[model samples]
Target chain A: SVQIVYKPVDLSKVTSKCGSLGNIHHKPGGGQVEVKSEKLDFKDRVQSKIGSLDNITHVPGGGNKKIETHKLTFR
Target chain B: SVQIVYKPVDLSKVTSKCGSLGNIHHKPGGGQVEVKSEKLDFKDRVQSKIGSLDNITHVPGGGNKKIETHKLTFR
Candidate 1:
């Protein structure tokens, strides 16, 4: 499965930022997320955790795959 | 907490794609993530649990606040 999703709402009441295929709710608390591939898989999703905003820059995922990340701060 | 993260690596052995502020490891098992806000919080992370790829299109998170989601199915 492959798809793309964007962010939403007034987006002004709070600070915000998104880049190509961004996940701004951002982590477990994050993102208007997007997933793209012929079909989605599990290991790939796990790798995403290795990278991203709060994550530590892809310890294991950094080895053999592509990873991206983002964050959202709500007050 | 506020930040942005991007993807990485040899995206050919497997299929791949991304979007603005994208998280492709995608969810917990997903995304290269990003986080945005004045200060990151916990509940927002929980809300992220409600929406995104497979969850449910934000049933409770659908009520108030922002929520986004994505998913990966591995082999």
Candidate 2:
């Protein structure tokens, strides 16, 4: 399994200095601030620990099976 | 667009009992331990939030344009 650890930006720093242009607003006054004061783009960020496993195998012709995984939400 | 959050498996507990057969190693005695003590499987683990956005659009004739994004490395 691949894992990611992230530190969210400080909202008070962004909001107090930059205002609400680029932050995401959450219910009850909390959420990620979206900063629209700069150019915005969409892309994928992938980080992997390569060579962690050896000799991985896939079943013949068993393509793209949907698997259930865990989801976590932070407040 | 999708997002994922993850919690890393504890290495000390895994390594002392299992050894370095399935863990990733980092420099300076700090890294993810590999445990080779059991049945292992390769899979893609993905987690996403539904209803976070109302609409998403993919441009036609712009197939799989690679865009650069930020990558964060943790210790």
Candidate number achieving the greatest DockQ relative to the actual structure: 1
DockQ of 1: 0.05
Worst 10 residues of 2 chain B by lDDT: B11-20
Candidate 2 per-residue C-alpha lDDT over A1-75 given as tens digits, one digit per residue, 9 for 90 to 100: 454454343212101111112112222212222212233232444223222222222111111122222334432
- TM-score per candidate: 0.13, 0.11
What's model 1's lDDT at A18?
22
RMSD of each: 27.3, 31.3
Output the worst ten-in-a-row residue range by lDDT, candidate 2 chain A. Answer: A11-20
The reply for model 1, stretches above 4 Å from the true place, is A1-12, A21-75, B1-23, B26-75
Model 2: lDDT of residue A40: 27
Output the lDDT of residue B61, model 2. 18
How close to the true structure is residue B58 of candidate 1, measured as C-alpha lDDT? 24
Q: Tell me the chain A TM-score of model 2.
A: 0.15
